[PDB]
RNA sequence: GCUAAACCUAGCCCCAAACCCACUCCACCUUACUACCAGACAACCUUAGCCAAACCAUUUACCCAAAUAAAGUAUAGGCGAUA
RNA sequence: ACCCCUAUACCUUCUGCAUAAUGAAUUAACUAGAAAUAACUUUGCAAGGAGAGCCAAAGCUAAGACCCCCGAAACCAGACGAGCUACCUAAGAACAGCUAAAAGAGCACACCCGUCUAUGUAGCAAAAUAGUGGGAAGAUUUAUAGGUAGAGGCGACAAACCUACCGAGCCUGGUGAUAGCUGGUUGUCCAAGAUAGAAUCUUAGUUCAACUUUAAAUUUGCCCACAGAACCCUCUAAAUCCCCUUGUAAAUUUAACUGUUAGUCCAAAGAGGAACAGCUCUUUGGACACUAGGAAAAAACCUUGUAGAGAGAGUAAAAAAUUUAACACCCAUAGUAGGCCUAAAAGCAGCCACCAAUUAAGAAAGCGUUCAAGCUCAACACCCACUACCUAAAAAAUCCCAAACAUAUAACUGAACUCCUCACACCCAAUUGGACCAAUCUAUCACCCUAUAGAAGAACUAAUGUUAGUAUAAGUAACAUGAAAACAUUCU
RNA sequence: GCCUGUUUACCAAAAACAUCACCUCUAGCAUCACCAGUAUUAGAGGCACCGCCUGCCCAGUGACACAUGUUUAACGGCCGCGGUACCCUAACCGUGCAAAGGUAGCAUAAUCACUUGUUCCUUAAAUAGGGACCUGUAUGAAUGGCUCCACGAGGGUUCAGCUGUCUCUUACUUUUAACCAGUGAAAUUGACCUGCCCGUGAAGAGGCGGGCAUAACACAGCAAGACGAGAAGACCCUAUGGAGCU
RNA sequence: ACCUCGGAGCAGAACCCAACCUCCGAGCAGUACAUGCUAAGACUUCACCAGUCAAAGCGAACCUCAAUUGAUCCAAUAACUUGACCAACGGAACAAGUUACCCUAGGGAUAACAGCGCAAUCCUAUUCUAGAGUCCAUAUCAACAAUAGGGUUUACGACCUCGAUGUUGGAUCAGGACAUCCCGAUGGUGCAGCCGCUAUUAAAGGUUCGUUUGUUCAACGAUUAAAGUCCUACGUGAUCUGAGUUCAGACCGGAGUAAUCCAGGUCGGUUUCUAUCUACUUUCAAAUUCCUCCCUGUACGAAAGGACAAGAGAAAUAAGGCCUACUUCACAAAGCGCCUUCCCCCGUAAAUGAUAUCAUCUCAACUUAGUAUUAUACCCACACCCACCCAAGAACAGGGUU
């Protein structure tokens, strides 16, 4: 039992046209955006900052849930969501809250919409982990997107160049892929254990 | 000592000289070796290519009037291999 | 006879083969250097030679001597093929039984095909057998005859079939096609004999250079001493060129040719790489592809070269030495719980200061304390071994690897090197030069097998070479005949 | 893949080829084919019954018209950047190019890679299988697109049934096999009087170096080695060597 | 990527010298028109072709630069002269792509698998003490660095092999190394106990069954004392499989006008050998491991929790045998059935005592744990042999025939 890597190329010939920077300040920033989606959204508590997620169509084209009214403060079991008295907008606020990835139980009666969500030692747990499962999937389709990207541009240029450069900048940057990929299953193992500790 | 080994002579080759052959009886172009019946149609045509030019694309002696010489000369030829 | 000491079969291709790189079971027979211009030698004649033609400022004529074999896929021309198979034409034949819904329907025989498995693989068979399968009244199968043929035929397109091997059939002919590629290239002995590169549809080849070989003319050839061979920045080496003597004996030029020109290792100066490789590329030198001795067997490391017999001798190179860590005994009272800073920080959290009491102890060098307290060390008192040659070792896979020996005087052993008696041409690849030579025929001799000359189908340990004989595998794989009997018959 | 059927005789029977259905193009015609036929016909083709459909383009090529044209069920093609509100998308806007900018449908597929895409069912365990989502940045409509009746020696998954496939093999018969009697091959063979360990060597030794072992000889098995035998590697490279095809 | 020419370094002081070695440049330009004609002697890019300098002489006034370039034939012209990025630049007058339908002659001169050389990469062991570990370098880890060892992996070289070294996994059989996963025995611990961490010694024995992917790798389920690493031509295909991976058919996406192609996916796709030589074909035997009860609910703690050691009993695997029960079966052979199975192993822990009058376990002389063995069980009768039988057996051999 062994495991086993390879090595890394580093010169001005690839430069030339194609910078190994860009794509590893990229997948960083993917890394950035998984952590914040991480320590911003569900934790432990609820928090009136994590309705800061997606909403539905509204007027062709969808916002937040945030920029639209405002969120207060009063109790810690309450999330009150007071608005300015416009019809479709509550409907489509109930409707892009309640199938999101945490079970909200919103209460609508107007205006005034209130959130409870007391604690639970399990279900609310098990909810969490599969959000945060699907932020990882949805880390690595960003991932994805940023590879074929890569791979669409290295194609457009290797008609000039011989193919073993083409086959070594390909290969770096699947070892690049696959550096990611691990340290994002890694992130999504330890907030999995975090959250069954 | 067994298997074995050995033989000369049938004939053949290259020349000279000289021009050379073919029905005993019957059968033999239809399914040849078939004795015996009505659409008769009928042949005349530049060789090519391998190969050499170190590839290959024009080109490359072979052609049927005795010898020797002129002479491998005049000539021809991607004026080149070569003729 | 064996036992003892020595010994890594041959050819070919290679830098290098015992290589586990190719070829070969053996025997007999057969099977591979054909020729010109120009040069050399020997005659003849001679400013002329020659038996017309042609050459000629010593030439002309004659003779001798000299340039291999087998092997492709391919191309073209003309014949021969549809008795197998692809399709078509003419006139025929076959399809039990059941359910038949009516049917390019269902189960299922005969028949056609061949999905899967197993046996077989020089087998029964150059495509089978046994089981299991699809179709089986149709676009079915099949008996006979005919037709479409290769720059083509045919094709429900598999680039499928066209007489067992069709990306283009087979036979004959051009054809002894060609091949820079592989293989082979047959008597004895002797001598000389290792190459800077350039060009190239060219790096698997060739030409000219270089080396080598033969035959000639001539005189200088090599080693070398004073002198000498710009510079500039920082250094600037081992060295190199020219070169009188001197030891030497070779060098230059002319004529005619082949062959080498796909090389390795070591020492040194370098470049590339990893200041890696039995790694790649130059330069200087050496060795090998040539004998022998040594380092275990070993190409390139050391000694050594010119050839034989000897049951003589002196020698060259030639045997690896190291074994390692001890350490001190004793005594610690005090201004003072030095000041600053710190909740506290007392010799030892952080700084400034580091004075000073007793014959001796630093305003503290290591710990240790939350701060203190306790342990030492630096210092007397006390005797005083040395109080230190610094450090500098490790494990892989079948089984360690000659046996051993610390103590009778430095010498001995050890080659194809050298000497000794004798005789001496008698140990390199390709290539070149030379002296001989068996069989055969012819001219003349010879007459129990030879001689002088001319000639050539003139020599086989080797080409998965051809034919024939016999071995090894091997007396091996494999192959047979149902039983009794009166040999009338009977039984399974 | 609509079905029956057809094919690589001798390693590929299939999802490949054909097939009824649909469509495009060509042709106004007499004696040897097509045809002793005449535009509901004949030939050259694509696709593949049926059911719903078959979106846009003649810029280029080809074809036809020679009136700059007509033709895509002809060859073929169906966009790019930026501003876009707390999140992937965005209705929207600005802008360039074009012939038009992928329409309906379907969808991680037999569909480059990322790919074990995400999710539910199935198993104790599911990179296998089935149902849902679409960044399919290389899907998509006679290069036909999508459902469906029947069928398939076509390719995958699976409930129940019990079968030595297996846990784990055992017994019996025949063939085979060993001996006896008869006949009697083939590949292979440099010569062999043909051992083991370590090391060396053209780098993997029965033949070399150092050790060990060692009377001769039949017969039956096994396959670790002889870099084992058949086929001058079929993979890689060269040849101013061939051939097929476009 | 390059193909021709020039300058510098490699190539330091006559000449020369390569590299898919390191840097610059060139395919011109500018001024006179004697940039006229002839002619000794020389240099020469290692050949040749080309290229370079030039005394004197006839005439006439009183050349810069470094490369700056192109042979023959042929064509234009009355002539003198002229004509190519013939740049593949010593230059064919004019010719591309594909072949997995392929063929031939060759090459280990040259690749893919193997072996071999190296160790860039990888793994491991020691040295210094930064830094973690509350303090505390060394219980444990280890930054920058240093010294060595190994040849699992990825690469490099092309040294045997292309007149063929069969290639990945899997099945059977395993041999070996220890750098030890478990069973054995010790040192230390940030060791109160159970679990643990690290180090030394120890290779006699063992190291599971299943789902998915063809997998070796990898994910998961249930276990176990453990489900160890590596080598053996990434062990073993003349013992077996071909699941993919190395053809000819075909489909999808894409590239290409097309043939055709993809280190893209998918369905299908012939595994031939009668053993000549070496080696071998019962070594007759001295097995391991888990679990249950007692101790004990004790030692230990504050409680939870919780042991060693001694003893007893049951098992599992492996080896060697057997047919009385059961079962396949039946005057036999077998397992699913039954019986038996016995010695250690050395790293340290301690007394006395010098070198060094203390002390000190001793590569000081010496004494203990400390050596199981100089182990015992099998088997060991030289010839009656036609023939018959046999629990003996291929033939042979062996036993009985009273
Ligand atoms: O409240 P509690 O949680 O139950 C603590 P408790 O019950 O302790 P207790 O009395 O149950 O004791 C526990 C064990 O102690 C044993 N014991 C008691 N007396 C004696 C023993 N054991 C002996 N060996 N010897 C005695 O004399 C009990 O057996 C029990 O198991 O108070
Ligand atoms: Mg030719
Ligand atoms: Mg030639
Ligand atoms: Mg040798
Ligand atoms: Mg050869
Ligand atoms: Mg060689
Ligand atoms: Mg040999
Ligand atoms: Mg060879
Ligand atoms: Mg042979
Ligand atoms: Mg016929
Ligand atoms: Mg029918
Ligand atoms: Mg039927
Ligand atoms: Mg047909
Ligand atoms: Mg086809
Ligand atoms: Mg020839
Ligand atoms: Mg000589
Ligand atoms: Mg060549
Ligand atoms: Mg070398
Ligand atoms: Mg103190
Ligand atoms: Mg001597
Ligand atoms: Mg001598
Ligand atoms: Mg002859
Ligand atoms: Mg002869
Ligand atoms: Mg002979
Ligand atoms: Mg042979
Ligand atoms: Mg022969
Ligand atoms: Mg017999
Ligand atoms: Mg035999
Ligand atoms: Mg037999
Ligand atoms: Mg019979
Ligand atoms: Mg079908
Ligand atoms: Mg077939
Ligand atoms: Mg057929
Ligand atoms: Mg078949
Ligand atoms: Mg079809
Ligand atoms: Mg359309
Ligand atoms: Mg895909
Ligand atoms: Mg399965
Ligand atoms: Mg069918
Ligand atoms: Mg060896
Ligand atoms: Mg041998
Ligand atoms: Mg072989
Ligand atoms: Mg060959
Ligand atoms: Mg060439
Ligand atoms: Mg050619
Ligand atoms: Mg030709
Ligand atoms: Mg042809
Ligand atoms: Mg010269
Ligand atoms: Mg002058
Ligand atoms: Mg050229
Ligand atoms: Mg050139
Ligand atoms: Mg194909
Ligand atoms: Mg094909
Ligand atoms: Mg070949
Ligand atoms: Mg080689
Ligand atoms: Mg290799
Ligand atoms: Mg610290
Ligand atoms: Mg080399
Ligand atoms: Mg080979
Ligand atoms: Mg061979
Ligand atoms: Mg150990
Ligand atoms: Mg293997
Ligand atoms: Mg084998
Ligand atoms: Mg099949
Ligand atoms: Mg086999
Ligand atoms: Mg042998
Ligand atoms: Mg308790």
Redesign the pocket.
């Known amino acids: 039992?062994?495991?086993?890597?390879?090595?890394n190329i580093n010169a001005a010939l690839v430069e030339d046209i194609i910078n190994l920077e860009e794509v590893n300040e990229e997948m960083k920033s993917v890394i950035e955006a998984l952590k914040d989606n991480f320590n911003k959204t569900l934790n432990i508590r609820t928090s009136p900052g994590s309705?800061?997620?997606?909403?539905?169509?509204?007027?062709?084209?969808?916002?937040?849930?945030?920029?639209?009214?405002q969120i207060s403060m009063k109790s810690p079991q309450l999330i009150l969501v007071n608005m300015a008295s416009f019809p479709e907008c509550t409907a489509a606020?109930i409707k892009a809250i309640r199938e999101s990835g945490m079970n909200l139980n919103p209460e609508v009666e107007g205006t005034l919409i209130r959130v409870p969500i007391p604690q639970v030692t399990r279900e609310h747990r098990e909810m969490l982990v599969?959000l945060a499962?699907?932020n990882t999937?949805?880390a690595?389709?960003?991932?994805?997107?940023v590879?074929?990207?890569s791979?669409?541009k290295l194609?457009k240029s290797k008609d000039?160049?011989?193919?073993?450069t083409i086959?070594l900048i390909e290969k770096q940057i699947?070892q690049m892929?696959?550096d990611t990929?691990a340290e994002l299953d890694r992130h999504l193992a330890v907030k999995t254990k975090e959250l069954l500790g």
């Open positions: 039992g062994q495991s086993q890597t390879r090595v309705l800061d997620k997606i909403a539905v169509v509204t007027a062709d084209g969808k916002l937040a849930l945030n920029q639209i009214s606020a599969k499962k699907q999937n949805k690595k389709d960003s991932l994805r997107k590879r074929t990207n791979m669409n194609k000039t160049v011989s193919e073993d086959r699947s892929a696959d990929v």
